[PDB]
PDB file of C-alpha atoms in Angstrom:
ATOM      1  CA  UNK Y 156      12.098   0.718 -16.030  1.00 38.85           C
ATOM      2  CA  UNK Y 157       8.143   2.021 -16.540  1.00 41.63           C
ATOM      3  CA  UNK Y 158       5.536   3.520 -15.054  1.00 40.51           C
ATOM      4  CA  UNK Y 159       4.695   1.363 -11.435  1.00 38.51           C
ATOM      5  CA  UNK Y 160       7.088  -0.328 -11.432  1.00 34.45           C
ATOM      6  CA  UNK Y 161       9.365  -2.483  -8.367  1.00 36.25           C
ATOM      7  CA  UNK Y 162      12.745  -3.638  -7.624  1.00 35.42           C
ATOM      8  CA  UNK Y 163      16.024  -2.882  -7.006  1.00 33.61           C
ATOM      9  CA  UNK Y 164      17.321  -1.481 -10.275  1.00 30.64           C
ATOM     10  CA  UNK Y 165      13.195   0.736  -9.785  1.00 29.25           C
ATOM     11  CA  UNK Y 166      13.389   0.832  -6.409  1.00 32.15           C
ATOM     12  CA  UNK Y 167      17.276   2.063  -5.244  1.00 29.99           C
ATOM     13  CA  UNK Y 168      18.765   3.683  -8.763  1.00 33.74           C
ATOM     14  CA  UNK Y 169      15.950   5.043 -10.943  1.00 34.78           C
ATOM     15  CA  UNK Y 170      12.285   5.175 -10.873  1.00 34.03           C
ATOM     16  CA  UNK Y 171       9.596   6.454 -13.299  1.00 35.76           C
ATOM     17  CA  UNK Y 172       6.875   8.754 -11.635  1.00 35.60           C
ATOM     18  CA  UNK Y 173       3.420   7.140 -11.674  1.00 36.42           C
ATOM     19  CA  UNK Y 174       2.559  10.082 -14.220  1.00 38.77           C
ATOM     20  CA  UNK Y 175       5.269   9.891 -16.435  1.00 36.18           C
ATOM     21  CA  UNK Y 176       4.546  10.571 -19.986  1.00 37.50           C
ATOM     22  CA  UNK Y 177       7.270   9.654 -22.554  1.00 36.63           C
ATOM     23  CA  UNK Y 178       8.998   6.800 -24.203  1.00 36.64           C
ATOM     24  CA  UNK Y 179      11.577   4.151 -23.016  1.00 35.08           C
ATOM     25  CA  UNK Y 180      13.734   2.483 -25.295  1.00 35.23           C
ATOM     26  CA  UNK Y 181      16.105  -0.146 -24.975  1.00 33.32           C
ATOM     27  CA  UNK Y 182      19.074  -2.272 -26.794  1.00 33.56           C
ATOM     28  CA  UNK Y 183      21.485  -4.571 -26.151  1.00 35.25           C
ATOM     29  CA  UNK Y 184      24.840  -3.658 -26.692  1.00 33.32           C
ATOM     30  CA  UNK Y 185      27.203  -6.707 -25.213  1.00 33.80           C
ATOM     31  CA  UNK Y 186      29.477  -5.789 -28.328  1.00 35.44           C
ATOM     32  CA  UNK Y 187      30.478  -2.378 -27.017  1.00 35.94           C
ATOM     33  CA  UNK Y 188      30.796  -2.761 -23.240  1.00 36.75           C
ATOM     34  CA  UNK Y 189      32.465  -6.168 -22.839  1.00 37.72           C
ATOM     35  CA  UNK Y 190      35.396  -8.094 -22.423  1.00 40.37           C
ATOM     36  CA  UNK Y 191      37.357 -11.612 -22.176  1.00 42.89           C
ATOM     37  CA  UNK Y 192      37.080 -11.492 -17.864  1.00 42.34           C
ATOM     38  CA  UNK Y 193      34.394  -9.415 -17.502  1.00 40.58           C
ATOM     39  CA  UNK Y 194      33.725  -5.943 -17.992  1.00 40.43           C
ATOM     40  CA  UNK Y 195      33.565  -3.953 -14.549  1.00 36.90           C
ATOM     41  CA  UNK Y 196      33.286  -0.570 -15.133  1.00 34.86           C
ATOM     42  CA  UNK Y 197      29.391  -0.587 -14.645  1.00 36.55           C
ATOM     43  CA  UNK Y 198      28.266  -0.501 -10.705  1.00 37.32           C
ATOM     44  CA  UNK Y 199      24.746  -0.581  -9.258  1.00 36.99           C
ATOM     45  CA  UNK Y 200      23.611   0.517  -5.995  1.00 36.45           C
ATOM     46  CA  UNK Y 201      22.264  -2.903  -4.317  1.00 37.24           C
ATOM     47  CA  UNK Y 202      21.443  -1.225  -1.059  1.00 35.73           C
ATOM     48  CA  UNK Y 203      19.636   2.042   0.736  1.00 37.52           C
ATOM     49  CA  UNK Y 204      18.324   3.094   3.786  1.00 35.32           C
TER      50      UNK Y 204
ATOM     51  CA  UNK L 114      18.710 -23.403   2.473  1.00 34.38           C
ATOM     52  CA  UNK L 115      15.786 -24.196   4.263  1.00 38.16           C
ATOM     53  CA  UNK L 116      13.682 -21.071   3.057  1.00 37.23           C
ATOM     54  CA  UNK L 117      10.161 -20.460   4.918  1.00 35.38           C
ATOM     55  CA  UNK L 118       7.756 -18.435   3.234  1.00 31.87           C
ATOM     56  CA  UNK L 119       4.646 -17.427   4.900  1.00 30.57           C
ATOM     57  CA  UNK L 120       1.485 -16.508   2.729  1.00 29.12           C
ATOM     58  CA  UNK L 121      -0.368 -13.540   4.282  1.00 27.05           C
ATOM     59  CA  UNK L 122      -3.779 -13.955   2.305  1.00 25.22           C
ATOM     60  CA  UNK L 123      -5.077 -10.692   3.687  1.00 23.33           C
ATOM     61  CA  UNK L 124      -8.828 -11.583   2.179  1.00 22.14           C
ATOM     62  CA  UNK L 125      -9.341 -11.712   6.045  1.00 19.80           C
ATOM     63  CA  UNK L 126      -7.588  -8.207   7.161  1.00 15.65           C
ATOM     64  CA  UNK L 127      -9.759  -7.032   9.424  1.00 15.29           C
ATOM     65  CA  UNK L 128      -9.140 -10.062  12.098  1.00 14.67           C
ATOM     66  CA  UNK L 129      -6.843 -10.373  15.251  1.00 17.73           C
ATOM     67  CA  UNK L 130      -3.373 -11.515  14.226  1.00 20.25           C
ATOM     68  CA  UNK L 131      -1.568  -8.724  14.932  1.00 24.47           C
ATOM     69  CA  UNK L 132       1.596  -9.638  17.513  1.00 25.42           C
ATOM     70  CA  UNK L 133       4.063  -6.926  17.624  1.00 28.85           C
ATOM     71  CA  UNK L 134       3.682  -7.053  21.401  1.00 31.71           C
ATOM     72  CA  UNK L 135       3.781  -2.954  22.028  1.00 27.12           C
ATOM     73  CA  UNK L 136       3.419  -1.052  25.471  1.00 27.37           C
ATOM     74  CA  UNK L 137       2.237   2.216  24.763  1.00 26.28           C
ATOM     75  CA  UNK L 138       0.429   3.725  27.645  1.00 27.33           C
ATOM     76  CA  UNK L 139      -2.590   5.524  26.401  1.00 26.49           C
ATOM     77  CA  UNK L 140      -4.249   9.023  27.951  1.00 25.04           C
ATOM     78  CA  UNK L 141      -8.553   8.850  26.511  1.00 21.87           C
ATOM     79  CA  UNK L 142     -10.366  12.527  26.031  1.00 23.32           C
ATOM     80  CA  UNK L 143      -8.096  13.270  22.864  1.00 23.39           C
ATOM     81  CA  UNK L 144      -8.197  13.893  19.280  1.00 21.78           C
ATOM     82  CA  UNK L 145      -6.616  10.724  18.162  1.00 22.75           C
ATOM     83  CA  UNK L 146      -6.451   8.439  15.268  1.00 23.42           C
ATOM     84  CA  UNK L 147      -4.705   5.121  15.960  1.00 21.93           C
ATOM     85  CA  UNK L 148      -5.405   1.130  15.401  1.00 20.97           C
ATOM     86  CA  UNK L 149      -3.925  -2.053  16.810  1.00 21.06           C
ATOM     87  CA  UNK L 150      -4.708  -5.548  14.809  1.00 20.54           C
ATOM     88  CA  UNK L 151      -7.616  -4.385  12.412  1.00 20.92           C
ATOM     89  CA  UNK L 152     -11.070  -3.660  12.248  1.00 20.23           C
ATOM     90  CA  UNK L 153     -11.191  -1.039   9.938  1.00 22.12           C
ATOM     91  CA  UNK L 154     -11.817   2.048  11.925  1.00 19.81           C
ATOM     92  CA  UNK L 155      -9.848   3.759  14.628  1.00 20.79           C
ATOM     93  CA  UNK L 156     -10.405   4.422  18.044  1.00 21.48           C
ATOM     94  CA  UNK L 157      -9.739   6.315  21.556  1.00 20.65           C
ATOM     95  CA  UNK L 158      -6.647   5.746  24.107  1.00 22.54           C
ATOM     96  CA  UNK L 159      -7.446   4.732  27.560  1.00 23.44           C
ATOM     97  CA  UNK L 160      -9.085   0.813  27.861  1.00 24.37           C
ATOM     98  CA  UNK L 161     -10.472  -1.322  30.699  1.00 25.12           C
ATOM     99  CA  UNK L 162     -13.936   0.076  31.189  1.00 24.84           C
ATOM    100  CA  UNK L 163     -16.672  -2.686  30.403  1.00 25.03           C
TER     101      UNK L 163
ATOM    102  CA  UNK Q 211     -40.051  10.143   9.441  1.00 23.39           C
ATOM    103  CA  UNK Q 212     -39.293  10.986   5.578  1.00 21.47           C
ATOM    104  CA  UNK Q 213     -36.553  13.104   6.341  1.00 25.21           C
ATOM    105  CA  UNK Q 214     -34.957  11.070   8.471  1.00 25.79           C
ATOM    106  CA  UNK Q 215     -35.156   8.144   6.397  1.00 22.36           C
ATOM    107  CA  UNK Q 216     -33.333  10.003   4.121  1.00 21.47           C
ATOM    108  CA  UNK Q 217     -30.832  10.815   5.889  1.00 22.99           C
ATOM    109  CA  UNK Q 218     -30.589   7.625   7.505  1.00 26.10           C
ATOM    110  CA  UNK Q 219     -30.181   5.901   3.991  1.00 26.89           C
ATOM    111  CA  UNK Q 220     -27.923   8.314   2.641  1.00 25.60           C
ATOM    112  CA  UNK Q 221     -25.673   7.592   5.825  1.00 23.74           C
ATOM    113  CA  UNK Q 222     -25.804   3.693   5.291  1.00 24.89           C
ATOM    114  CA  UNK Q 223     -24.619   3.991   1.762  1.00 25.05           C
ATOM    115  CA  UNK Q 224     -20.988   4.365   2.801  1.00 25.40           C
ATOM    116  CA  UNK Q 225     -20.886   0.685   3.314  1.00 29.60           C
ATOM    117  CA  UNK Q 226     -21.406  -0.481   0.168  1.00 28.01           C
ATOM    118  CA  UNK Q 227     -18.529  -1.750  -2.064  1.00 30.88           C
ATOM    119  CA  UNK Q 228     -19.686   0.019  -5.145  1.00 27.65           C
ATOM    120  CA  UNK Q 229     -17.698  -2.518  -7.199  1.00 26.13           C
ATOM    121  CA  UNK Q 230     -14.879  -1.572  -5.596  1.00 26.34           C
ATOM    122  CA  UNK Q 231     -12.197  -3.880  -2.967  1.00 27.14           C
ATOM    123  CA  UNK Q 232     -13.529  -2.654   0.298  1.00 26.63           C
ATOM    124  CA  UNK Q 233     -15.804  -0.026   1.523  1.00 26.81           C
ATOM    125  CA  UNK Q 234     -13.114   1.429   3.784  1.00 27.81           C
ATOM    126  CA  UNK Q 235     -10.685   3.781   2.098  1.00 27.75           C
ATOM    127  CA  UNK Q 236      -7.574   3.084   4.815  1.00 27.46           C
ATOM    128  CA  UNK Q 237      -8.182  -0.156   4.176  1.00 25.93           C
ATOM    129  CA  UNK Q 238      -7.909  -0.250  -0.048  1.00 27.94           C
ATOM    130  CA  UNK Q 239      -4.903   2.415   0.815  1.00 28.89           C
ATOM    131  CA  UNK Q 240      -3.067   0.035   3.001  1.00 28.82           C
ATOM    132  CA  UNK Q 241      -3.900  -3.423   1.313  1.00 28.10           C
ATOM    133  CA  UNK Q 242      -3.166  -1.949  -2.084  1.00 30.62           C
ATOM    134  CA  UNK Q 243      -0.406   0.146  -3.727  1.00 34.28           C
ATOM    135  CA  UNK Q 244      -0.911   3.721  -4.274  1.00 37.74           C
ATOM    136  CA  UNK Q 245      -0.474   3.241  -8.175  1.00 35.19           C
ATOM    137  CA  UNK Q 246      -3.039   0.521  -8.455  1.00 30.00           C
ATOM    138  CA  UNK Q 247      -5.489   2.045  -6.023  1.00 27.87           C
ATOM    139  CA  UNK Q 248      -7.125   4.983  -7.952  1.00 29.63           C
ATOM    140  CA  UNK Q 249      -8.594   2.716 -10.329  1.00 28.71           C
ATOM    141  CA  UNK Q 250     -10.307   1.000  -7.596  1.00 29.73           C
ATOM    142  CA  UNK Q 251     -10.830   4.482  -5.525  1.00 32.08           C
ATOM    143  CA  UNK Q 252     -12.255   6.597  -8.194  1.00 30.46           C
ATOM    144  CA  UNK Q 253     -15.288   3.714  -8.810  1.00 32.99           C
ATOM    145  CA  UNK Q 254     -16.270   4.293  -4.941  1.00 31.39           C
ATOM    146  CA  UNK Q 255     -15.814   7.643  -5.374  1.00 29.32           C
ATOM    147  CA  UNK Q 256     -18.074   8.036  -7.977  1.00 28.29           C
ATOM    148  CA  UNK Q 257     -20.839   5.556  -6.096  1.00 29.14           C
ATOM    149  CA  UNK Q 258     -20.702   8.013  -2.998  1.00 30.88           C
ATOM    150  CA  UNK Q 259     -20.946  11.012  -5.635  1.00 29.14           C
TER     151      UNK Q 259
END
């Protein structure tokens, strides 16, 4: 998730312009959004035309 | 698996390993930009002439 | 003969790399991505400036 950058989670959900100007920031939060199982209320799109 | 990966150096582009094996019939005396395998340029339909 | 010298070496110029991938802009476009090819574009277009 910057400037430039590939992949699926950059390429198919959410990409930065090549002239973006601002910050990124980033945690982890496993604490909040987790559970004994698995925790799937977060989906992804994996595919696009 | 069995995974095959090629390597496609490309410090050799312009060359003749192009194989997409296309039919494309081609009229010459036309404003036309167009390229098959590379050379780095571009060219005019019609062939066959010398 | 001085004139068209010139002109003549002003034409030939485009071939040089100018410190730059290739002397052919298609070809720097295609080989390269768009976000990594101005830096490499602006140095031949400042040699043909």
């Amino acid at each position: 998730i910057a400037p430039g950058q590939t992949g699926k989670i950059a390429d198919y959900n959410y990409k930065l312009p090549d002239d973006f100007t601002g910050c990124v920031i980033a945690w982890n939060s496993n604490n909040l959004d987790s559970k004994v199982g698995g925790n799937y209320n977060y989906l992804y799109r994996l595919f696009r035309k | 698996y069995r995974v095959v990966v090629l390597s496609f150096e490309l410090l050799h582009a312009p060359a003749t390993v192009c194989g997409p094996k296309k039919s494309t019939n081609l009229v010459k005396n036309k404003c036309v930009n167009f390229n098959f395998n590379g050379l780095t340029g571009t060219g005019v339909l019609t062939e066959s002439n010398k | 003969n001085q004139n068209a010298q010139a002109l003549n070496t002003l034409v030939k110029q485009l071939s040089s790399n100018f410190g730059a991938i290739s002397s052919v802009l298609n070809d720097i476009l295609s080989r390269l991505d768009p976000p990594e090819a101005e830096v490499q574009i602006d140095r031949l277009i400042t040699g043909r400036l």
